[PDB]
């Protein structure tokens, strides 16, 4: 069994569900921005989903990332961004501003506050429905406020579920995406390219994902997935030392799972 720096780790064969690696796999820990995996899953589950629908960027979303010192996609207030573009902004640079836009959009309620509350409720319901017992969300990005934890095992199940969606899969393996949005005056703005923070996409042969995570207590986390010769390994590493350490941990676990 490989030795990793992360305090928590887990991996399984995505196809069969067989656990391939474990390390404090069921110990609750802050998820940080990896929570966005659930945010995306909930959105993609909406029956009234229209990926081409345009959402106006509110000043609230920009103030939010500032007030919470959160990673952002640099969405400009007044811009009209499609739900699909928001999914890229959410998953590539870890846009907490995009997370707010999606929660506001897909939560139920007559006000923004009521809608974000409703959305977070859907995230918890989604976890429950997956049979999870060690996952809880009090925010839509894992950076908001309250209790936001999961476990390497729970998070891997969430990601596996999300990977069943073709849009999710596409977004998650994209290294770079340049959004062309509509400004408040009708012209089309070419935003600075969004680069995926997941270094494994270009450093690990066969890497398909999923997503990085960070936060004051979420330090450096990573939900990874790779496919090699018809076998897909998916897993999570929580609370690693550094970025390089994080990628090495994920690499070791995946290489181990592929050899078994």
From Swiss-Prot:
Effect of mutating residue 96 to A/N: 10% of wild-type catalytic efficiency for aminolysis reaction, but increased catalytic efficiency for hydrolysis reaction
Swiss-Prot/TrEMBL keywords: Carboxypeptidase, Cell shape, Cell wall biogenesis/degradation, Hydrolase, Peptidoglycan synthesis, Protease, Secreted, Signal
Keyword hit for Secreted: yes
GO annotation terms (biological process): cell wall organization; peptidoglycan biosynthetic process; proteolysis; regulation of cell shape
Binding site for substrate: 211
GO molecular function annotation: serine-type D-Ala-D-Ala carboxypeptidase activity
EC id: 3.4.16.4
Subcellular location: Secreted
Any GO CC annotation of this UniProt entry: extracellular region
Pathway of action: Cell wall biogenesis; peptidoglycan biosynthesis
Active site: 33, 36, 94
Top-level taxon in the UniProt lineage: Bacteria
Keyword Iron: no
Alphabetical list of Pfam families matching this protein: Peptidase_S11 (PF00768)
InterPro entries: Beta-lactam/transpept-like (IPR012338), Peptidase_S11 (IPR018044), Peptidase_S11_N (IPR001967)
Catalytic activity: Preferential cleavage: (Ac)2-L-Lys-D-Ala-|-D-Ala. Also transpeptidation of peptidyl-alanyl moieties that are N-acyl substituents of D-alanine
Primary subcellular site in the record, as a coarse category: secreted
Top class in the EC scheme: hydrolase
Function comment: Removes C-terminal D-alanyl residues from sugar-peptide cell wall precursors.
Similarity comment: Belongs to the peptidase S11 family.
Protein name: D-alanyl-D-alanine carboxypeptidase
Organism field: Streptomyces sp. (strain K15)
């Amino acid at each position: 069994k490989p030795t990793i720096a992360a305090v928590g780790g887990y991996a399984m064969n995505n196809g069969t569900g067989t656990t391939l690696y474990t390390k404090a796999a069921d110990t609750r820990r802050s998820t940080g921005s990896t929570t966005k995996i659930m945010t995306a899953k909930v959105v993609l589950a909406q029956s009234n989903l229209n990926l081409d629908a345009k959402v106006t960027i509110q000043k609230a979303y920009s103030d939010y990332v500032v007030a919470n010192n959160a990673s952002q996609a640099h969405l400009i207030v007044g811009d009209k961004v499609t739900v699909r573009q928001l999914l890229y902004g959410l998953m590539l640079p870890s846009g907490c501003d995009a997370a707010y836009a999606l929660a506001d959009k897909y939560g139920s309620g007559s006000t923004r506050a009521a809608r974000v509350k409703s959305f977070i409720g859907k995230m918890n319901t989604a976890a429950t429905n997956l049979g999870l017992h060690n996952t809880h969300f009090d925010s839509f990005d894992g950076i908001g406020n309250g209790a936001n934890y999961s476990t390497p095992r729970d998070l891997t199940k969430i990601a596996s579920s999300a990977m069943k969606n073709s849009t999710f899969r596409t977004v998650v393996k994209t290294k770079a995406y340049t959004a062309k949005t509509v400004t408040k005056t009708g012209s089309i703005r070419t935003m600075d390219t969004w680069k995926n923070t997941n270094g494994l996409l270009s450093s690990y042969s066969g890497a398909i994902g999923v997503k990085t995570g960070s936060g004051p207590e979420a330090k450096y986390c990573l939900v990874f997935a790779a496919t090699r010769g018809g076998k897909t390994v998916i897993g999570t590493v929580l609370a690693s030392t550094s970025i390089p350490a994080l990628e090495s941990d994920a690499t070791k676990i995946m290489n181990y799972g592929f050899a078994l």
